Amino acid sequence: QVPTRKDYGSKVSLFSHLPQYSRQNSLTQFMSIPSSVIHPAMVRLGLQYSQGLVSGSNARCIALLRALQQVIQDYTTPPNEELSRDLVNKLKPYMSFLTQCRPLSASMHNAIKFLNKEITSVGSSKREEEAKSELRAAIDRYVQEKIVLAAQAISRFAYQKISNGDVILVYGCSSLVSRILQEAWTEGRRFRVVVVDSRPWLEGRHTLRSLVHAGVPASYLLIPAASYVLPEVSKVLLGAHALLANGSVMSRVGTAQLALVARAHNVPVLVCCETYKFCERVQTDAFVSNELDDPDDLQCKRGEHVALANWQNHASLRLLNLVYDVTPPELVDLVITELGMIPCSSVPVVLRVKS
Amino acid sequence: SERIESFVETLKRGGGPRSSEEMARETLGLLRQIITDHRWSNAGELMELIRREGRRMTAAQPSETTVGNMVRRVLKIIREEYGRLHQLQSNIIEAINELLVELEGTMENIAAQALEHIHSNEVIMTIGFSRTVEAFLKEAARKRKFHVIVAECAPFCQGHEMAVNLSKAGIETTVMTDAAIFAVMSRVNKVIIGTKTILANGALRAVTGTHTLALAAKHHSTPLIVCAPMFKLSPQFPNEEDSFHKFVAPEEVLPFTEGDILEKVSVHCPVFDYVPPELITLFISNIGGNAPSYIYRLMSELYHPDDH
Amino acid sequence: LIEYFKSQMKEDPDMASAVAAIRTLLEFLKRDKGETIQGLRANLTSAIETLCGSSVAVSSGGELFLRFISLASLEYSDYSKCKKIMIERGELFLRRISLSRNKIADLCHTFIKDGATILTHAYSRVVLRVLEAAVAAKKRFSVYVTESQPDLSGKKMAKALCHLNVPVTVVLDAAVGYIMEKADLVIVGAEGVVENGGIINKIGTNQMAVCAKAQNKPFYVVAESFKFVRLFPLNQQDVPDKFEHPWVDYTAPSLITLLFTDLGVLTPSAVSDELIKLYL
């Protein structure tokens, strides 16, 4: 089943590989409502993504691990199956369903592949409850190991540079760049953070109102004119969520329009990422791996509502709203990983180890 | 028998089998045969024979780096083979057979990873014919219509043939002379070049216009891939000078006609050039997609410190 | 022990200042009580007590042999642990460190360009070892040097190099610009190397090397297997307390070309693999 489709509007020439999506609600013309065998649970989260109700580049991993923990804690192991290939085949189209709903990952699958490993590694003769509870138990130990008990440890390195006097600059929302810049006011060392935020889905406000309740002072500037913080910066702790083996740093669409707009003023640029969120692909530019999203959000109600909606009725005016970008590792300094402060060019050297 | 001597003459006179793992299939052939039935002592007298026949083979035209490359890799399989051995002919010939079968599929798997790079309506650009770049670009004909700009350089030019073999099966090529690679390359993206051999430090030794081309890439900031398979990672960082090339007869650049001017004038003809690792911005390879600055350890993944 | 180490380096026209400290902590590690774990911490205090004096390499050897001795906690024993096997293992680690420079020269020798004009801004030991072997088997080359103002120590290389019998000129340290139009293959040795492949040496190095990658000539560096620290700076004025009174400067690894080590020839982005292969 699983129709999908529903593409809206005319993509802007150039890239047609990527598929634009609109809020048509997927099944709001499609799905069934007794159980609808597509998803016992994952239809909940799958509905929850598309509206924009999780969306943080971390904790999607937490979400998918939670729902997969329940559905893995619902399986039945039929009378003619080994339950390894059976379940391992059974999880396929459901993950394809969430893949249909949103571009599936910003390194989220590393989790999915890990699940496929742990499912494939299952012993051939045990109790269903034994292997089941063992499986979800390991599925917990993972999120405790590489998601919970590492972000705490990747703050202890960050204090070593964040000392008194500096004027740091984070960008938009972040998952780690709030923890390891807010467990540094506690333990003293006063500074003055300045945050900068991008024109749609602003996302900078989540920082600027999650930080004033710590007490470290602030300032605010939109990314369009971040050429005044740069003559007074002393770092930029621009953290992001996918490291690609060619030393590329897949950020939000804004970053690395700041980085290579910083190193023409001689202020450093320090990235902060985790240890599972680095992936074994390689990409050279932005136009092979972006993810467009609903080009109707761009509507500035700034007086007479100059036609934004009216564009559909206009001839030739494709609006495009990209989601990712790329940072090439000649404009990137140290990466503060959870195994030391490794150099950018050794982005592959973390891969072979622990493999 | 001593048919290898014919082979030792075969590389001597020239007449290339077009690098298509034919030098590799041959070097695997002769190494398989000398490996098969020869003198036998336990303590690497086979390996000493590999050193002797090796250095005799490397006494050919010092440009066919694939010959010595697969020679050295045969030696590393010998060293690891003895390493586990601490009936060896069975294991050695079997593993060499496995390396042969692995070598048997380079141009496909190195061409699968093509949809993930070239996008719609994207003016790609190369220079000089190469088998891997043409096969690689032919598997991106199940995507949109881009352009291809091919340079007609390096005379004697083996380049056009490719402009035929592409344009009658694919995208709208145009063919430019070599001396117009800087009015173009202001209107391009995503340069590709095939590689004659790639060095330890990260260097590309290629056709005689690769430099002057890569300089334009790191002048306008467009990324250049050098799609090159395995078995062409050469050790010996660029120390030996001027044996790095092939100087051919200057008949190819000046005709024997126009007499007397050819008394006092000096003609030069280089076949290869030198691309340093400060300008390459990705390697597409047979197993991964590794960056320039990592290439070092990949070489240590294959060989052993008998790199001489 | 201070008089012991100073005694060890007093009667030494070669050997590392660092190697002298290494043998000093070797013997003063041998003749001490407390064959136990926490007794090593006393040596750690001695590691501070040796570190009294400058010269970053001393701390590098401190953590180096601190880790070499410290690895004997694995393969566990009691009161006769295999750090005593690292007395001769170590002794042969000390002769391993002693025979280091010869391999660096035998690898390095080939890059001299037979009509080259090698520039150097120092007074280095191993530079003179490799360059001495370079004339002692091969072609000819000029050498230009400048003198480091708070030592004038370049003139020591002028003298000893004149005993090596090759044509030397030496201009002052302000006009390196005027030098580099007539020069190729800039070679310098280095005190320490940080974890991203950057060098720290005397207090003029960046003033050249910034000018090295403007006139497109290369820039090599060369050091033994004892300059690898876990330290990681990111800017000038962020060096530690190791300095009209600065003594050492920093050169970013976007400028250092292929460097040489006792592990072999090396690229400036593979040092991290070595140290991360060691430290964890």
Side-chain angles (χ1 to χ4, degrees), chain A residues 3 8-15 17 19-21 31 34 40-41 46 49 52 56 59-60 63 67 78-79 93 97 102-104 106 109 111 114 123 131 137-138 142 150-151 153 157-159 161 165 171-172 179 184-185 188 191 193 200-202 204-205 213-215 217-218 220 224-226 228 231 239-242 245 247 254 256 259 262 264-265 268 276 286-287 295 298 303 307 309 311-312 314-315 317 324 328-329 340 343 348, chain B residues 7 14-17 24 29 40 43-44 54 59-60 62 68 72 82-83 95 105 107 111-112 114 117 119 121 123-126 128-129 135-137 140-141 146-151 154-157 159-160 163 165 167 169-170 173-175 179-184 187-188 190-194 199-200 202-203 206 209 211 213-214 216-217 219-220 223-225 228-229 231-233 235 238 244-245 249-250 254-256 259 267-270 272 274 276-277 279-281 283-284 288-289 291-292 294 297 299 303-305, chain C residues 4 13 16 18 20-21 34 39 42 47 53 57 61-62 72 90 105 108 110-111 115-124 126-128 130-131 133-137 141 143-146 148-150 154-155 158 160-161 166-170 172 174-178 180 183 186-190 192-194 196-198 200 204-205 208-209 211-212 214 218-223 228-229 231-234 239-240 242 246-248 250-253 255 257 259-260 264-266 268 270-271 273 275-276:
Chain A
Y8 152 102
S10 81
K11 301 146 193 167
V12 60
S13 75
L14 222 213
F15 51 133
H17 296 132
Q20 275 210 36
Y21 202 104
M31 277 287 100
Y49 291 166
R60 279 202 205 163
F97 169 68
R102 181 60 180 270
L104 177 49
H109 15 222
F114 166 63
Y142 180 79
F157 292 159
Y159 173 57
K161 289 180 186 89
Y171 180 78
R179 177 74 162 277
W185 183 270
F191 41 82
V193 187
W201 72 94
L202 303 172
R205 299 188 181 177
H213 295 96
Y220 192 74
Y228 265 18
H241 47 93
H265 275 154
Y276 71 98
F287 295 102
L298 283 82
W311 59 270
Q312 186 69 262
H314 254 295
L317 206 151
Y324 289 181
Chain B
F7 179 75
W40 292 110
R72 292 183 187 93
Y82 178 73
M107 293 181 191
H117 297 290
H119 64 94
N121 199 356
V123 192
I124 209 162
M125 195 262 190
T126 64
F129 166 81
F136 181 85
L137 200 48
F146 39 81
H147 295 67
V148 174
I149 309 296
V150 170
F156 59 90
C157 59
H160 300 291
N165 202 7
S167 173
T173 74
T174 73
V175 175
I181 201 157
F182 205 70
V184 185
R187 263 76 169 168
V188 85
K190 196 78 85 56
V191 179
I192 303 174
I193 300 98
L199 297 174
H211 212 91
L213 177 63
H219 181 272
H220 279 283
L224 62 80
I225 313 163
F231 70 83
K232 206 179 263 72
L233 309 170
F244 179 75
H245 312 80
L254 260 171
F256 197 76
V267 198
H268 295 282
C269 280
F272 294 161
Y274 184 69
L279 308 182
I280 305 172
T281 59
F283 288 162
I284 285 170
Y294 179 68
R297 196 178 75 84
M299 191 178 85
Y303 299 148
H304 177 68
Chain C
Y4 174 66
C108 178
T110 65
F111 285 167
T117 60
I118 293 161
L119 212 155
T120 307
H121 181 80
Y123 174 71
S124 168
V126 292
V127 168
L128 295 172
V130 64
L131 199 44
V135 67
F141 44 82
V143 168
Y144 286 23
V145 189
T146 58
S148 166
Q149 195 66 41
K155 301 175 77 60
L161 192 50
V166 282
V168 181
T169 311
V170 43
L172 46 84
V176 189
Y178 188 84
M180 289 197 77
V186 175
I187 289 174
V188 70
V193 285
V194 294
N196 54 2
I200 47 156
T205 310
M208 277 182 67
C211 192
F219 188 93
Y220 302 8
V221 290
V222 45
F228 300 161
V229 297
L231 195 70
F232 200 97
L234 61 101
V239 304
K242 284 174 183 76
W247 283 344
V248 288
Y250 183 75
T251 56
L255 271 67
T257 319
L259 86 166
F260 302 137
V265 70
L266 204 53
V271 61
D273 192 9
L275 48 82
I276 211 61

